[PDB]
Write an enzyme that holds these catalytic residues in place. Structure first.
Site, PDB file in Angstrom:
ATOM      1  N   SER A 197       0.813  -1.194   0.000  1.00 33.78           N
ATOM      2  CA  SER A 197       0.000   0.000   0.000  1.00 33.78           C
ATOM      3  C   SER A 197       0.871   1.279   0.000  1.00 33.78           C
ATOM      4  CB  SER A 197      -0.959  -0.055   1.176  1.00 33.78           C
ATOM      5  OG  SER A 197      -2.210   0.412   0.715  1.00 33.78           O
ATOM      6  N   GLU A 324      -8.788  -5.196  -4.444  1.00 31.78           N
ATOM      7  CA  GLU A 324      -8.153  -4.074  -3.760  1.00 31.78           C
ATOM      8  C   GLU A 324      -9.148  -3.026  -3.309  1.00 31.78           C
ATOM      9  OE1 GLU A 324      -5.113  -4.205  -2.961  1.00 31.78           O
ATOM     10  OE2 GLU A 324      -3.927  -5.280  -4.470  1.00 31.78           O
ATOM     11  N   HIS A 437      -7.501  -5.926   0.139  1.00 33.67           N
ATOM     12  CA  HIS A 437      -6.312  -5.088   0.130  1.00 33.67           C
ATOM     13  C   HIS A 437      -5.634  -5.337   1.485  1.00 33.67           C
ATOM     14  CE1 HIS A 437      -3.907  -1.472  -0.770  1.00 33.67           C
ATOM     15  NE2 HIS A 437      -4.279  -0.923   0.370  1.00 33.67           N
TER      16      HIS A 437
HETATM   17  C1  CFQ Z   1      -2.206  -3.317   5.134  1.00 37.75           C
HETATM   18 AS1  CFQ Z   1      -3.628  -1.621   5.203  1.00 37.75          AS
HETATM   19  C2  CFQ Z   1      -3.068  -0.087   3.692  1.00 37.75           C
HETATM   20  C3  CFQ Z   1      -3.473  -0.668   7.201  1.00 37.75           C
HETATM   21  C4  CFQ Z   1      -5.681  -2.329   4.849  1.00 37.75           C
HETATM   22  C5  CFQ Z   1      -6.678  -1.297   5.351  1.00 37.75           C
HETATM   23  O1  CFQ Z   1      -6.132   0.063   5.305  1.00 37.75           O
HETATM   24  C6  CFQ Z   1      -6.749   1.070   4.433  1.00 37.75           C
HETATM   25  C7  CFQ Z   1      -8.283   1.212   4.781  1.00 37.75           C
HETATM   26  C8  CFQ Z   1      -9.165   1.228   3.668  1.00 37.75           C
HETATM   27  C9  CFQ Z   1     -10.520   1.368   3.822  1.00 37.75           C
HETATM   28  C10 CFQ Z   1     -11.054   1.498   5.092  1.00 37.75           C
HETATM   29  C11 CFQ Z   1     -10.248   1.493   6.231  1.00 37.75           C
HETATM   30  C12 CFQ Z   1      -8.847   1.356   6.125  1.00 37.75           C
HETATM   31  N1  CFQ Z   1      -8.105   1.399   7.456  1.00 37.75           N
HETATM   32  O2  CFQ Z   1      -8.682   1.558   8.521  1.00 37.75           O
HETATM   33  O3  CFQ Z   1      -6.897   1.301   7.530  1.00 37.75           O
HETATM   34  C13 CFQ Z   1      -5.958   2.405   4.499  1.00 37.75           C
HETATM   35  F1  CFQ Z   1      -6.735   3.472   4.445  1.00 37.75           F
HETATM   36  F2  CFQ Z   1      -5.236   2.526   5.601  1.00 37.75           F
HETATM   37  F3  CFQ Z   1      -5.146   2.532   3.484  1.00 37.75           F
END
Ligand code: CFQ
Ligand code: CFQ
Ligand code: CFQ
Ligand code: CFQ
Ligand code: NAG
Ligand code: NAG
Ligand code: NAG
Ligand code: NAG
Ligand code: CL
EC number: 3.1.1.7
Lengths: 532, 528
Positions: A197, A324, A437
């Site tokens: 990400s 994703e 994702h």
């Molecule tokens: C391995 As991660 C890039 C901390 C998966 C989730 O993170 C997304 C997200 C996407 C949609 C809703 C909530 C979140 N979240 O709480 O982290 C974001 F935004 F961090 F990229």
């Protein structure tokens, strides 16, 4: 002693930790920069000054100040991504997992967590680096960096809040690794930076940035690339947001000096609470403070640097997950719920594409819609759901990464592309969300090897081949083991454009990953919008 | 006698003709207007002055002056559309087929040939109306009208060449039928106008034009509708082309009357020889002289008239054929050949789309390309061919008509839509061309019934049912006689396939591509 190390800066004392009926060394919470606090908030990070005596590095450090997700309190699927340590501005630390007995001069892998540049922690249960270090005998490093306003407030022209300091923290942890990893049995000449990400975007920004180029050998990017629409903003947009942040906290706005002095007087949580108020439109998959095209960390537009081959030439391994987008639609789009199939009506689809492509005019939204609608069956809630899902994932992740892979390859020394489409047997999120994702991560880190987490045998096997591809890529630059009898992940080439699926079925080679839609997102829409 | 008829303008003597081991009356070349020659060139038609004595209506009349196709000399698939009589400017005649014994006040169907307003004849072997009149017992009429410059030279504001005179010719032929068809056993209150292509378009223009509405009861449109991109131009574009024609024949261009008098002094072929030079773009499925939105024959824009329901409210039956574009790619696009699979490279595809959508800008061309290209297999010669074959067909015929059908149905009193996808077993054109523009016509006119023409037994039956649907529609406004062909409604949007297999009902005819052509592309082009 195996657990005591003489780094350039000072002595360090690690801890022995058990791992799959064995043990390995861990050095947690090692400082790599002076705490970016007080009048130092928003400033370029400064090297950690040397210390006397032993530094207790037996426990995870603090997580940086960030917005905590409270959508589903106590739900493991979301909190697994929240800070699990006290937040603090004093968070610039890195973690190392070293096999026992200590290796001589082995491959290093540096992990750069993601989280839209507004969140993320190095200490999460899914980033426990012991399994991968132990299993593949690599030295695994977990770094950290300021996120949100703290790491990205950008008032260009100012040296107090220049922007990109969170990217600069990463670079300093990398320099740290480059100056000291050898004392841990790691080869500074063979460090692979990898991230998911905003972490995958970071990796790519280091591939582009001249000042980060020589701090690593190879790169791995998962579900993110530097040119992602959400990964950067212009100096103007950067300045506007910092000003609006100030207007949101009744700050003096006469000069960057006064604005900045004001912000440094606010408690962390005060900034965090207005953080989302500075964005241009109501939307999903957009974050407030992110990297800026400053002409310094980034000499020119990402695109021109990409078109002119102005970046580090090496081997890269990268890919994406099947769905994703679902995570984002769930959090911010009407119709989606974690307690249902989330079948979407035609009305919710329309409002959904608007929330997803915030920068697009009317003609633009029409084009997207036209592109993802089955007009023979336009009321089908499942098609509308999957349709919006693909919109979000194609626009924000997949197509920007394909654009990047395709450009990088004309100049690089080796590209390997993957499509992760395995839905974990124990996922806690609903069925409609698919291969979410962030969910290949638990496979990359080998969590499936810990029997008590209830993964199927084949999932343990997938995890083992993924870690082996990664590590093998890290050591050699090619995920494949020479003269091996197993199926081979072929090289991605601009002419053939091959990639593989990553799941429990025997490997399959495909070509031109989502070309149709990416031709739309990467070539057509950009033009339509330029035409205006 | 059964062959002698007293018309209002004068006496007429037809002739007995055999038809499927039987006979029916035929009245050929009945004049319905003063020959539009000399001073009359380019002017509104004038009603035929009554005559004394008996008019010899036993043989076909002259065909109007037109560009004859010579692409494939000798070849029947193309020559079957060329004039088969001498060409003359004295060509305003109509033909009537009357069943024997003469019927009493029966259903009438008036045919309007097509050919992009630049060509067409009423005498082609495929328009022989004896089979349809005899088999369905209808009084079948085929009229004619000036085409090319002769029917559409348009210098708006002048009375010497106002534009639309060719449409006015059709209208006069309709007035004639209205005033006289009763003398032939036809009911003037039950007249159906049907036509294909420029003819199907003309039908729709009469549905639109206030001045033509009361001259017919219902309408049938085959592979053409009034709003087709190629079926009309604005008063300025019309004037621009008229002037450009003068410039091409070194005419005085000081004033309209002078330019006109000069064009009148040219021999017919001289005008025909420069006809295509006035088109603004290099293209296909585009014709020089066509109807003009003049504010008179057509009050306002075709679209505003359609949105406001400003048109004749009656029943309509229409449809298209599966492969409308092929005829046009063959003639004007590189890569295509009458003697090969015509597989198209990616390059010939790009140019082929530029030739098909001449008005669109680059962004437009991209959207078209994006839309018809499979990027996982962009060098597939067949997909490229079939792909370009859909662009030309969707853009020029299918989508303009689905737009028409949907606007009309909001106010209309009954719509029936068809999709003709049968390929004649005896086709002389190559397989890649598919179900070609104009080839439902031999079925509508029942040529499959004459055994020596070698159609399969099931093609005769397809022809028989198509004719019965047409005639039954003409007579009752519903093609079904008490497997049904369901009504088309804005909610369901149902239509049927017209082939040899058992009838199948479908919905939303080519909605995907037509949403692109009718809604998205137009918007794109306007914005940019
Ligand atoms: C391995 As991660 C890039 C901390 C998966 C989730 O993170 C997304 C997200 C996407 C949609 C809703 C909530 C979140 N979240 O709480 O982290 C974001 F935004 F961090 F990229
Ligand atoms: C005042 As808010 C409703 C925390 C602004 C954006 O909110 C997003 C969001 C919230 C939490 C993590 C990631 C995202 N995102 O990537 O868009 C969504 F989805 F709730 F609208
Ligand atoms: C029932 As007809 C409308 C006379 C068959 C096709 O005619 C087209 C055409 C299309 C492409 C190439 C040549 C021709 N043609 O010679 O007639 C045109 F132009 F008449 F409409
Ligand atoms: C000087 As020329 C080669 C007769 C301009 C247009 O020609 C068309 C054409 C020629 C004959 C009948 C119909 C068409 N048409 O509909 O476009 C095509 F196809 F040859 F280019
Ligand atoms: C003596 C020392 O400084 N090392 C300590 C270690 O004993 C303790 O288990 C750990 C947890 O707080 O912190 C560190
Ligand atoms: C896949 C690829 O491009 N690998 C190249 C290789 O062919 C070349 O020999 C080497 C030395 O320059 O650089 C790298
Ligand atoms: C009887 C009469 O006057 N009608 C004539 C017919 O005799 C003649 O054979 C034909 C020539 O085409 O023209 C018509
Ligand atoms: C399909 C359709 O529109 N049919 C209508 C019919 O319902 C109505 O009774 C009639 C007279 O008003 O006009 C026509
Ligand atoms: Cl005049």
């Amino acid at each position: 002693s195996e657990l005591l190390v003489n780094t350039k800066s000072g002595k360090v004392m690690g801890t022995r930790v058990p791992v799959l009926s064995s043990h390995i060394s861990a050095f947690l919470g090692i400082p790599f920069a002076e705490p970016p606090v007080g009048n130092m908030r928003f400033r370029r990070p400064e090297p950690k000054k040397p210390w006397s005596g032993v530094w207790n590095a037996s426990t995870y450090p603090n997580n940086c100040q960030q917005y905590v997700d409270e959508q589903f309190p106590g739900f493991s699927g979301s909190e697994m991504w929240n800070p699990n340590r006290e937040m603090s501005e004093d968070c610039l630390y890195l973690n190392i997992w070293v096999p026992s007995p200590r290796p001589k001069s082995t491959t290093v892998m540096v992990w750069i967590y993601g989280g839209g540049f507004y969140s993320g922690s190095s200490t999460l249960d899914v980033y426990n680096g012991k399994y991968l270090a132990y299993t593949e005998e690599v030295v695994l490093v977990s770094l950290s960096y300021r996120v949100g306003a703290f790491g990205f407030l950008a008032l260009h022209g100012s040296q107090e809040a220049p922007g990109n300091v969170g990217l600069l923290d990463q670079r300093m942890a990398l320099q740290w690794v480059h100056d000291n990893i050898q004392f841990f049995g790691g080869d500074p000449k063979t460090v692979t930076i990898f991230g998911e990400s905003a972490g995958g975007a970071s990796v790519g920004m280091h591939i582009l940035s001249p000042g980060s180029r020589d701090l690593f050998r190879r790169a791995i990017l998962q579900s993110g690339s530097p040119n992602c629409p959400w990964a950067s903003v212009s100096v103007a947009e950067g300045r506007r947001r910092a000003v609006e942040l100030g207007r949101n906290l009744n700050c003096n706005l006469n000069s960057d000096e006064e604005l900045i002095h004001c912000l440094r007087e606010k408690k962390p949580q005060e900034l965090i609470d207005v953080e989302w108020n500075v964005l241009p439109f109501d939307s999903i998959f957009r974050f407030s403070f992110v990297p800026v095209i400053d002409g310094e960390f980034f000499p020119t537009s990402l695109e021109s640097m990409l078109n002119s081959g102005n970046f580090k030439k090496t081997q890269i391994l990268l890919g994406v997950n099947k769905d994703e987008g679902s995570f984002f639609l769930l959090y911010g789009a009407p119709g989606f719920s974690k307690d249902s199939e989330s079948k979407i009506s035609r009305e919710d689809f329309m409002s959904g594409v608007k929330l997803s492509v915030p920068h697009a005019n009317d003609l633009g939204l029409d084009a997207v819609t036209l592109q993802y609608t089955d007009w023979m069956d336009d009321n089908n809630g499942i098609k509308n759901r999957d349709g919006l899902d693909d919109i979000v994932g194609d626009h924000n992740v997949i197509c920007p990464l394909m654009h990047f892979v395709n450009k990088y390859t004309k100049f690089g020394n080796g590209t390997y592309l993957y499509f992760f489409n395995h839905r974990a047997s124990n996922l806690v999120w609903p069925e409609w969300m698919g291969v979410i994702h962030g969910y290949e991560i638990e496979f990359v880190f080998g969590l499936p090897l810990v029997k008590e987490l209830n993964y199927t045998a084949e999932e343990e096997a997938l995890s083992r081949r993924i870690m082996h591809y990664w590590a093998t890529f890290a050591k050699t630059g090619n995920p494949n083991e020479p003269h091996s009898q197993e199926s081979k992940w072929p090289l991605f080439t601009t002419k053939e454009q091959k990639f593989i699926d990553l799941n429990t079925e025997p490997m399959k080679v495909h070509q031109r990953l989502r070309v149709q839609m990416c031709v739309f997102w990467n070539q057509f829409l950009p033009k339509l919008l330029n035409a205006t």
